[PDB]
Amino acid sequence: GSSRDALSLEEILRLYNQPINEEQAWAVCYQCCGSLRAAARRRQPRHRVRSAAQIRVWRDGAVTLAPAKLGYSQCMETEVIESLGIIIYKALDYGLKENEERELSPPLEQLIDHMANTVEEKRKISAIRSYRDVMKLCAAHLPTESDAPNHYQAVCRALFAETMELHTFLT
């Protein structure tokens, strides 16, 4: 392997040969939504997350979506959030048998149910309309919500460092 500054979530899963943990799921969600919110503000077009290969985790803890007011366009925020929600659940389910299901903490399960529009605060949360809505739910996972920006960067920084050693050195 050769050392670089980003790995895809697909590569991360392949290297681990196991699913991501719950804290990593919250972190990728928060960090990727932050990147997407900023990209939209700078008028880069929205597009959907088609697969885990498109999600890039960086050395400094950033998470971005690789390339292919603006409130309405050919790709709405909720569509991007849905596609991200589905990919995050696949990452949490990675390698499990079809007849097994992971027992997620209720607030993480709820976040994902609402991201993915699979819903059929203790019963149901307000519908997610924006990247900021998702980020606020991830911040709420923490006892002190103002810790979120630093915390979720630190989570992805560690995930990168840990998998980069497998990337560089696994044969």
Partner: peptide
């Protein structure tokens, strides 16, 4: 890290997400 798993429920989140592929 997966650790804790249950049997797949017929109406649960895994069930619903699988049908969106």
């Amino acid at each position: 890290s997966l650790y804790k798993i249950k049997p797949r429920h017929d109406s649960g989140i895994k069930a619903k997400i699988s049908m969106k592929t």
